[PDB]
């Protein structure tokens, strides 16, 4: 007789709001997700999941935009949908990244099946050291294994590396990505979002000044992705007598070459 | 009489009154330098400021600044190498080099705005030029032939769109730089009826969050992402246009910097 709040006790003691919905509700069915799309929830409802936990918030803010989002139309039939689902939806966000080693992360290490080249996991960023391979052919890797259908790439394409720094998430900003760069000696940093101003610069200058380093962006999502599906494993085992899964979603952007 | 580095602050800043602790200021160099020529740029790269040198222009004018933050970072700017190498070659430039920032946006039509209008030959079609934004009606298109459109006339390699590639355009709004998120875009929307936005860059977890939900309801909207840099370069390309005018004897370049990043797809 799982209710909300006994999956939102589990979680939070592995170790973010009830968005919306029943706590004391009992659970059918979980899905997980990076974003609560309104096709996500849709998506749940066909599974029969009554619990949704995403990564991000329902109304495309990290802070509380209800107000300013009251007279919208996209708001008013997202919370419509949302009011005829019966679902409830979870915001697990915080706590899976602070727990020892970043749950998000480790996610997205075990999806480039590289456990086993992690040099050292820091609190906001991951180290591995792999055989060698060009900073396109990290690239082409990650895609693949991602299953994305493009990445960027700042920096020299064809720098050697062996030494590589993951920045899950928006953390891709010059105070916590540049320092790495000679603090951990790395050829390279792929991260999924940041300031276009900050560490692809920092990277521009460097290529120019010699060096042999690069920038792999993949994308916020597709850096989160790995970890969400993570998280339905990890709670399928919590709840054995709950079906739950990993919804994937498409691509935000395509590209227009 | 000649024309000093502080002379070209003061007809740039001419007509907008003073910004409370604006990092429009003078990164390095000497105010009192006269001014051989000049050199707009986006950024104020390692190769940038070697061509300014290259091509004896003494003045640098760029819209961002130097040391990969809108604040420099002292701390982390004392150890690595490549801080240290542009320090040097700043130095032993003998360039001014002054961040027009504030004061180019806060112009009566906003300066790096009305350059990204005229690169895409829209200066005809412009419905209103709010604070910060501008809305355009233009011939219909598809969200996808103005990703084309805007490609093609910016000269860049790639664009990026989110929503319905098949979104029927006629009322377009236009963000320049890091106005894309959800604050300022998302508003114009429904208070001005727009089939898409043009932006630079914002949180992708913002108005492409919306636009995917908007779609997702049937909604025919459509988002094109050019690029940060994409979205600024024109305005210092005719900020180097202008100058040239106001400074004639002076030789005026626009500086153009590779694209920041490659597709791999
Ligand atoms: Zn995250
Ligand atoms: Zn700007």
Same mark, same amino acid.
């Given at each position: 007789?799982?209710? $909300?709040?006994?999956?939102?006790?589990?979680?939070?003691?592995?170790?973010?709001?009830?968005?919306?919905?029943?706590?004391?509700?009992?659970?059918?069915?979980?899905?997980?997700?990076?974003?609560?799309?309104?096709?996500?929830?849709?998506?749940?409802?066909?599974?029969?999941?009554?619990?949704?936990?995403?990564?991000?918030?329902?109304?495309?803010?990290?802070?509380?935009?209800?107000?300013?989002?009251?007279?919208?139309?996209?708001?008013?039939?997202?919370?419509?949908?949302?009011?005829?689902?019966?679902?409830?939806?979870?915001?697990?966000?915080?706590?899976?990244?602070?727990?020892? !080693?970043?749950?998000?992360?480790?996610?997205?290490?075990?999806?480039?099946?590289?456990?086993?080249?992690?040099?050292?996991?820091?609190?906001?960023?991951?180290? $591995?050291?792999?055989?060698?391979?060009?900073?396109?052919?990290?690239?082409?890797?990650?895609?693949?294994?991602?299953?994305?259908?493009?990445?960027?790439?700042?920096?020299?394409?064809?720098?050697?590396?062996?030494?590589?720094?993951?920045?899950?998430?928006?953390?891709?900003?010059?105070?916590?990505?540049?320092?790495?760069?000679?603090?951990?000696?790395?050829?390279?940093?792929?991260?999924?979002?940041?300031?276009?101003?900050?560490? !692809?610069?920092?990277?521009?200058?460097? $290529?120019?000044?010699?060096?042999?380093?690069?920038?792999?962006?993949?994308?916020?999502?597709?850096?989160?992705?790995?970890?969400?599906?993570?998280?339905?494993?990890?709670?399928?085992?919590?709840?054995?007598?709950?079906?739950?899964?990993?919804?994937?979603?498409?691509?935000?952007?395509?590209?227009?070459?």
């Amino acid at each position: 007789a799982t209710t $909300v709040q006994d999956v939102i006790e589990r979680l939070t003691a592995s170790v973010d709001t009830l968005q919306h919905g029943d706590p004391n509700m009992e659970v059918k069915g979980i899905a997980t997700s990076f974003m609560p799309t309104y096709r996500v929830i849709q998506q749940a409802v066909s599974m029969e999941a009554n619990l949704l936990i995403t990564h991000e918030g329902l109304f495309y803010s990290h802070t509380d935009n209800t107000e300013m989002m009251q007279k919208d139309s996209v708001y008013q039939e997202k919370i419509r949908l949302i009011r005829e689902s019966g679902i409830a939806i979870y915001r697990f966000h915080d706590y899976w990244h602070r727990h020892q !080693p970043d749950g998000i992360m480790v996610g997205f290490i075990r999806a480039l099946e590289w456990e086993s080249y992690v040099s050292k996991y820091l609190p906001t960023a991951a180290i $591995v050291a792999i055989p060698l391979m060009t900073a396109k052919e990290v690239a082409e890797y990650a895609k693949e294994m991602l299953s994305i259908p493009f990445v960027r790439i700042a920096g020299d394409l064809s720098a050697p590396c062996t030494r590589i720094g993951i920045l899950v998430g928006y953390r891709g900003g010059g105070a916590l990505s540049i320092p790495l760069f000679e603090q951990e000696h790395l050829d390279a940093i792929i991260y999924g979002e940041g300031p276009e101003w900050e560490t !692809p610069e920092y990277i521009r200058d460097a $290529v120019y000044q010699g060096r042999q380093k690069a920038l792999i962006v993949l994308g916020h999502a597709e850096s989160e992705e790995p970890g969400m599906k993570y998280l339905a494993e990890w709670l399928g085992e919590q709840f054995p007598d709950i079906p739950v899964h990993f919804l994937r979603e498409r691509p935000i952007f395509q590209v227009i070459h």
